[PDB]
Amino acid sequence: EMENVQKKLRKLERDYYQIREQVVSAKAGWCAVMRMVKDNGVERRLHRRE
Amino acid sequence: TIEERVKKIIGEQLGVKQEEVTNNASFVEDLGADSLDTVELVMALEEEFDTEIPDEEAEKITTVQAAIDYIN
Amino acid sequence: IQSLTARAPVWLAAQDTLNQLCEQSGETLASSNDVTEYMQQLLEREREAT
Amino acid sequence: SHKQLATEQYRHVEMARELAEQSGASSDLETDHQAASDHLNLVQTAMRQ
């Protein structure tokens, strides 16, 4: 039973790996957008924090 | 050298350039990266080196230099 | 947490309007009484300019 | 779950080790009990003679 949970751990590990690539790739673009947005839009116009 | 990874990734994760980061400063407050941004930075470091860093060790990277200290 | 979450959006909308309003003026407001006294100064400027 | 599984495997190995010792003891006891059954039959035989 526990060896199947180990193999479950492996499957979960590759799922985690996928999620991790998603996160890093997303931040790479967030960087660029928040670079360009600093032409006073982000101050309060686009950042409708409500 | 291999540190070019870290000193590259850091910038790519924080918007600063390679030379902007100073070893004396701290990510949490002296780089502008908040809790989420620092989590993203440490987790990107984890991804790049194909390794793992538990929570306890991961929390000890608040300073710029630490990013290499645990690596090398 | 549920109470705070229900309360949050209203407070945030109110804060955005307040920041816009006081930034539109030269003076920065901090309390209800402060807003009232600013009302009075506004009236005095009305009745001089007129 | 990874560390739990690692710890549970270490515990599992320890319980498996003690049962290996009892399994050996059971084979030794089977050997002693075979001799014991023979001893009973030898005594029954001696009583008849």
PDB file of all heavy atoms in Angstrom, chain A residues 10-24:
ATOM      1  N   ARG A  10       5.589  10.331  -6.530  1.00  0.00           N
ATOM      2  CA  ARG A  10       6.220  10.667  -7.807  1.00  0.00           C
ATOM      3  C   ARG A  10       5.258  11.397  -8.745  1.00  0.00           C
ATOM      4  O   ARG A  10       5.623  12.406  -9.374  1.00  0.00           O
ATOM      5  CB  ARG A  10       6.778   9.403  -8.464  1.00  0.00           C
ATOM      6  CG  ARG A  10       7.606   9.657  -9.710  1.00  0.00           C
ATOM      7  CD  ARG A  10       8.780  10.585  -9.463  1.00  0.00           C
ATOM      8  NE  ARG A  10       9.531  10.284  -8.250  1.00  0.00           N
ATOM      9  CZ  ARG A  10      10.271   9.198  -8.068  1.00  0.00           C
ATOM     10  NH1 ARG A  10      10.368   8.261  -8.998  1.00  0.00           N
ATOM     11  NH2 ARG A  10      10.933   9.055  -6.923  1.00  0.00           N
ATOM     12  N   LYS A  11       4.094  10.905  -8.882  1.00  0.00           N
ATOM     13  CA  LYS A  11       3.123  11.570  -9.752  1.00  0.00           C
ATOM     14  C   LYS A  11       2.857  12.998  -9.277  1.00  0.00           C
ATOM     15  O   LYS A  11       2.833  13.951 -10.076  1.00  0.00           O
ATOM     16  CB  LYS A  11       1.833  10.747  -9.799  1.00  0.00           C
ATOM     17  CG  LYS A  11       2.077   9.309 -10.252  1.00  0.00           C
ATOM     18  CD  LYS A  11       0.919   8.700 -11.034  1.00  0.00           C
ATOM     19  CE  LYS A  11      -0.334   8.559 -10.182  1.00  0.00           C
ATOM     20  NZ  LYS A  11      -1.453   7.962 -10.958  1.00  0.00           N
ATOM     21  N   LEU A  12       2.695  13.171  -7.966  1.00  0.00           N
ATOM     22  CA  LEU A  12       2.481  14.498  -7.403  1.00  0.00           C
ATOM     23  C   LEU A  12       3.687  15.395  -7.641  1.00  0.00           C
ATOM     24  O   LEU A  12       3.542  16.603  -7.854  1.00  0.00           O
ATOM     25  CB  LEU A  12       2.194  14.378  -5.907  1.00  0.00           C
ATOM     26  CG  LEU A  12       0.861  13.728  -5.532  1.00  0.00           C
ATOM     27  CD1 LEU A  12       0.804  13.428  -4.043  1.00  0.00           C
ATOM     28  CD2 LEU A  12      -0.295  14.625  -5.940  1.00  0.00           C
ATOM     29  N   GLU A  13       4.887  14.820  -7.595  1.00  0.00           N
ATOM     30  CA  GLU A  13       6.096  15.596  -7.817  1.00  0.00           C
ATOM     31  C   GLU A  13       6.133  16.154  -9.233  1.00  0.00           C
ATOM     32  O   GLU A  13       6.458  17.332  -9.437  1.00  0.00           O
ATOM     33  CB  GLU A  13       7.322  14.725  -7.533  1.00  0.00           C
ATOM     34  CG  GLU A  13       8.655  15.428  -7.720  1.00  0.00           C
ATOM     35  CD  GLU A  13       9.121  15.452  -9.166  1.00  0.00           C
ATOM     36  OE1 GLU A  13       8.651  14.612  -9.964  1.00  0.00           O
ATOM     37  OE2 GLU A  13       9.956  16.315  -9.503  1.00  0.00           O
ATOM     38  N   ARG A  14       5.800  15.334 -10.229  1.00  0.00           N
ATOM     39  CA  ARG A  14       5.768  15.879 -11.586  1.00  0.00           C
ATOM     40  C   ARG A  14       4.659  16.920 -11.756  1.00  0.00           C
ATOM     41  O   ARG A  14       4.839  17.908 -12.489  1.00  0.00           O
ATOM     42  CB  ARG A  14       5.647  14.765 -12.628  1.00  0.00           C
ATOM     43  CG  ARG A  14       4.391  13.921 -12.589  1.00  0.00           C
ATOM     44  CD  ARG A  14       4.354  13.034 -13.829  1.00  0.00           C
ATOM     45  NE  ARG A  14       5.479  12.102 -13.875  1.00  0.00           N
ATOM     46  CZ  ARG A  14       5.419  10.807 -13.588  1.00  0.00           C
ATOM     47  NH1 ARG A  14       4.285  10.223 -13.239  1.00  0.00           N
ATOM     48  NH2 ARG A  14       6.530  10.079 -13.669  1.00  0.00           N
ATOM     49  N   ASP A  15       3.523  16.746 -11.072  1.00  0.00           N
ATOM     50  CA  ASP A  15       2.502  17.793 -11.101  1.00  0.00           C
ATOM     51  C   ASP A  15       3.044  19.110 -10.541  1.00  0.00           C
ATOM     52  O   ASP A  15       2.837  20.187 -11.125  1.00  0.00           O
ATOM     53  CB  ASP A  15       1.282  17.338 -10.304  1.00  0.00           C
ATOM     54  CG  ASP A  15       0.099  18.269 -10.466  1.00  0.00           C
ATOM     55  OD1 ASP A  15       0.096  19.074 -11.422  1.00  0.00           O
ATOM     56  OD2 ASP A  15      -0.826  18.200  -9.630  1.00  0.00           O
ATOM     57  N   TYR A  16       3.736  19.033  -9.407  1.00  0.00           N
ATOM     58  CA  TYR A  16       4.371  20.202  -8.808  1.00  0.00           C
ATOM     59  C   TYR A  16       5.338  20.860  -9.784  1.00  0.00           C
ATOM     60  O   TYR A  16       5.417  22.090  -9.882  1.00  0.00           O
ATOM     61  CB  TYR A  16       5.099  19.770  -7.536  1.00  0.00           C
ATOM     62  CG  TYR A  16       5.950  20.828  -6.881  1.00  0.00           C
ATOM     63  CD1 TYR A  16       5.381  21.935  -6.276  1.00  0.00           C
ATOM     64  CD2 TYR A  16       7.327  20.700  -6.843  1.00  0.00           C
ATOM     65  CE1 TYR A  16       6.160  22.894  -5.674  1.00  0.00           C
ATOM     66  CE2 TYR A  16       8.113  21.649  -6.241  1.00  0.00           C
ATOM     67  CZ  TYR A  16       7.526  22.745  -5.653  1.00  0.00           C
ATOM     68  OH  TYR A  16       8.316  23.694  -5.051  1.00  0.00           O
ATOM     69  N   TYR A  17       6.102  20.037 -10.497  1.00  0.00           N
ATOM     70  CA  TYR A  17       7.066  20.524 -11.479  1.00  0.00           C
ATOM     71  C   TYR A  17       6.374  21.359 -12.559  1.00  0.00           C
ATOM     72  O   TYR A  17       6.813  22.472 -12.905  1.00  0.00           O
ATOM     73  CB  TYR A  17       7.765  19.288 -12.053  1.00  0.00           C
ATOM     74  CG  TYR A  17       8.970  19.470 -12.938  1.00  0.00           C
ATOM     75  CD1 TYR A  17      10.211  19.770 -12.398  1.00  0.00           C
ATOM     76  CD2 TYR A  17       8.892  19.228 -14.296  1.00  0.00           C
ATOM     77  CE1 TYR A  17      11.323  19.899 -13.197  1.00  0.00           C
ATOM     78  CE2 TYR A  17       9.998  19.348 -15.102  1.00  0.00           C
ATOM     79  CZ  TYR A  17      11.213  19.681 -14.549  1.00  0.00           C
ATOM     80  OH  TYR A  17      12.319  19.800 -15.355  1.00  0.00           O
ATOM     81  N   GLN A  18       5.259  20.838 -13.079  1.00  0.00           N
ATOM     82  CA  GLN A  18       4.461  21.581 -14.052  1.00  0.00           C
ATOM     83  C   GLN A  18       4.010  22.928 -13.487  1.00  0.00           C
ATOM     84  O   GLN A  18       4.184  23.987 -14.121  1.00  0.00           O
ATOM     85  CB  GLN A  18       3.267  20.715 -14.467  1.00  0.00           C
ATOM     86  CG  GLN A  18       2.268  21.343 -15.421  1.00  0.00           C
ATOM     87  CD  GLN A  18       0.866  20.804 -15.196  1.00  0.00           C
ATOM     88  OE1 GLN A  18       0.607  19.617 -15.408  1.00  0.00           O
ATOM     89  NE2 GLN A  18      -0.036  21.670 -14.751  1.00  0.00           N
ATOM     90  N   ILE A  19       3.430  22.910 -12.285  1.00  0.00           N
ATOM     91  CA  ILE A  19       2.941  24.149 -11.680  1.00  0.00           C
ATOM     92  C   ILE A  19       4.079  25.158 -11.553  1.00  0.00           C
ATOM     93  O   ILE A  19       3.901  26.368 -11.772  1.00  0.00           O
ATOM     94  CB  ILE A  19       2.299  23.843 -10.316  1.00  0.00           C
ATOM     95  CG1 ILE A  19       1.006  23.042 -10.504  1.00  0.00           C
ATOM     96  CG2 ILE A  19       2.031  25.118  -9.540  1.00  0.00           C
ATOM     97  CD1 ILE A  19      -0.188  23.860 -10.930  1.00  0.00           C
ATOM     98  N   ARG A  20       5.265  24.672 -11.193  1.00  0.00           N
ATOM     99  CA  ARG A  20       6.404  25.550 -10.965  1.00  0.00           C
ATOM    100  C   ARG A  20       6.818  26.263 -12.248  1.00  0.00           C
ATOM    101  O   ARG A  20       7.085  27.482 -12.245  1.00  0.00           O
ATOM    102  CB  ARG A  20       7.550  24.716 -10.398  1.00  0.00           C
ATOM    103  CG  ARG A  20       8.720  25.501  -9.888  1.00  0.00           C
ATOM    104  CD  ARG A  20       9.659  24.606  -9.090  1.00  0.00           C
ATOM    105  NE  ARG A  20      10.439  23.691  -9.916  1.00  0.00           N
ATOM    106  CZ  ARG A  20      11.128  22.665  -9.435  1.00  0.00           C
ATOM    107  NH1 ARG A  20      11.165  22.405  -8.138  1.00  0.00           N
ATOM    108  NH2 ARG A  20      11.802  21.881 -10.273  1.00  0.00           N
ATOM    109  N   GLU A  21       6.873  25.524 -13.360  1.00  0.00           N
ATOM    110  CA  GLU A  21       7.157  26.198 -14.627  1.00  0.00           C
ATOM    111  C   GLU A  21       6.106  27.258 -14.924  1.00  0.00           C
ATOM    112  O   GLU A  21       6.438  28.372 -15.363  1.00  0.00           O
ATOM    113  CB  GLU A  21       7.230  25.206 -15.789  1.00  0.00           C
ATOM    114  CG  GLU A  21       8.350  24.179 -15.686  1.00  0.00           C
ATOM    115  CD  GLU A  21       7.857  22.750 -15.769  1.00  0.00           C
ATOM    116  OE1 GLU A  21       6.686  22.539 -16.151  1.00  0.00           O
ATOM    117  OE2 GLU A  21       8.641  21.833 -15.457  1.00  0.00           O
ATOM    118  N   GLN A  22       4.830  26.936 -14.688  1.00  0.00           N
ATOM    119  CA  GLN A  22       3.792  27.941 -14.917  1.00  0.00           C
ATOM    120  C   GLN A  22       4.113  29.229 -14.168  1.00  0.00           C
ATOM    121  O   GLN A  22       4.080  30.325 -14.746  1.00  0.00           O
ATOM    122  CB  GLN A  22       2.423  27.415 -14.483  1.00  0.00           C
ATOM    123  CG  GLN A  22       1.862  26.286 -15.338  1.00  0.00           C
ATOM    124  CD  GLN A  22       0.656  25.628 -14.694  1.00  0.00           C
ATOM    125  OE1 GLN A  22       0.642  24.418 -14.466  1.00  0.00           O
ATOM    126  NE2 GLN A  22      -0.371  26.426 -14.405  1.00  0.00           N
ATOM    127  N   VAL A  23       4.466  29.104 -12.887  1.00  0.00           N
ATOM    128  CA  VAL A  23       4.659  30.292 -12.055  1.00  0.00           C
ATOM    129  C   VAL A  23       5.808  31.143 -12.587  1.00  0.00           C
ATOM    130  O   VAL A  23       5.673  32.369 -12.768  1.00  0.00           O
ATOM    131  CB  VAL A  23       4.899  29.881 -10.593  1.00  0.00           C
ATOM    132  CG1 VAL A  23       5.348  31.074  -9.773  1.00  0.00           C
ATOM    133  CG2 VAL A  23       3.633  29.276  -9.996  1.00  0.00           C
ATOM    134  N   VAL A  24       6.961  30.519 -12.834  1.00  0.00           N
ATOM    135  CA  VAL A  24       8.121  31.319 -13.222  1.00  0.00           C
ATOM    136  C   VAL A  24       7.873  31.999 -14.568  1.00  0.00           C
ATOM    137  O   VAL A  24       8.164  33.200 -14.749  1.00  0.00           O
ATOM    138  CB  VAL A  24       9.395  30.453 -13.235  1.00  0.00           C
ATOM    139  CG1 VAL A  24       9.564  29.736 -11.894  1.00  0.00           C
ATOM    140  CG2 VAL A  24       9.366  29.450 -14.374  1.00  0.00           C
TER     141      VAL A  24
END
